[PDB]
């Protein structure tokens, strides 16, 4: 493919990331150590893990736990 | 064009080593994921690992502890390798494609034979 | 941990009959992004490799057959053959492909005649 309908992996157009992967920017699939990574980076946005997603900020009513 | 063949020895003493090689065509192992899956004679099916696109492995908890699966992409193959093997241990072995984020183990290997004995 | 647990072990119907059969995970297999139940059905004939049927639970795969019908949802799934053809004497399994890969002990299907 040129472009991904839906999601990109591996040099692959996928229908929805898979776990242990999350959807990132909603476009590509990433893997918790590159989420991690942009975490420490801003230690802007301090990303986080949320319904499959790695995200700039935690939703209303959610807080960071910090380790995982 | 989507293939995967399995080599296996086809029989393995008790408790030595077995080592399996999937060789693969059609597609690129970088993009896709290889599972390893037994069927000991008229049993089910056990899950026994799988290689992601990016190298890293998943496996069985049980056979975790003498299981290794790693793969040459360069080759497209595809290597099982099993620690100290029982009578139980007896079954067909298949490599099968995971296209994962999309479908299931959608193609499969035939299959290959090994029996453990004396 | 995931296990999927088949039901009838095995079950004998003369051609042209309905069949159903269920699988039942322990864990919801239901991916909160898509809402699609990460489950697959395959089709295993005697001495043959198996051959996928149905993922996503009720996408049936390209060169399935319009009798082959997977339902449910989360923990609960059936495969239903509407009209069994002579050709369709196999053992169906599901497997989980959420996190790892689980399949369930299988359903033999014997044909009466």
């Known amino acids: 493919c040129v472009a991904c309908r839906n999601f990109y992996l591996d040099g692959r157009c996928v229908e929805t990331c898979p776990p242990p992967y999350y959807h990132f920017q909603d476009w590509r699939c990433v893997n918790f150590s590159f989420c991690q990574d942009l975490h420490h980076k801003c230690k802007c946005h301090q990303y986080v893990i949320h319904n499959n997603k790695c995200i700039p900020e935690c939703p209303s009513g959610y807080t960071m736990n910090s380790s995982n | 064009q989507v293939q995967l063949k399995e080599s296996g020895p086809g029989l393995v003493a008790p408790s030595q080593s077995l080592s399996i090689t999937c060789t693969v065509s059609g597609f690129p192992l970088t993009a896709y994921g290889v599972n390893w899956v037994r069927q000991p004679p008229g049993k089910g099916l056990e899950w026994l690992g799988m290689?992601?696109?990016?190298?890293?492995?998943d496996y069985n908890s049980a056979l975790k502890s003498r299981l290794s699966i790693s793969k040459d992409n360069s080759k497209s193959q595809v290597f099982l390798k099993m620690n100290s093997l029982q009578t139980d241990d007896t079954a067909r072995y298949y490599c099968?494609?995971?296209?994962?984020?999309?479908?299931?183990?959608?193609?499969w290997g035939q299959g290959t034979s090994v029996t453990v004995s004396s | 941990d995931i296990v999927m647990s088949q039901s009838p072990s095995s079950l004998v119907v003369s051609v042209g009959e309905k069949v159903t059969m269920s699988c039942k995970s322990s864990?919801?297999?239901?991916?909160?992004?898509?809402?699609?139940?990460?489950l697959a059905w395959y089709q295993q004939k005697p001495g043959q490799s198996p051959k996928l049927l149905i993922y996503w639970a009720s996408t049936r795969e390209s060169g399935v057959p319009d009798r082959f019908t997977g339902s449910g949802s989360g923990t609960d799934f059936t495969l239903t053959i509407s009209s069994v053809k002579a050709e369709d004497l196999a053992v169906y399994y599901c497997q989980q492909y959420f996190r790892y890969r689980t399949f369930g002990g299988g359903t033999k299907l014997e044909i009466k005649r």
């Open positions: 099968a494609r995971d296209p994962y984020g999309s479908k299931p183990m959608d193609y």
């Open positions: 290689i992601w696109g990016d190298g890293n492995t």
């Open positions: 864990q919801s297999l239901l991916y909160s992004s898509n809402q699609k139940n990460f």
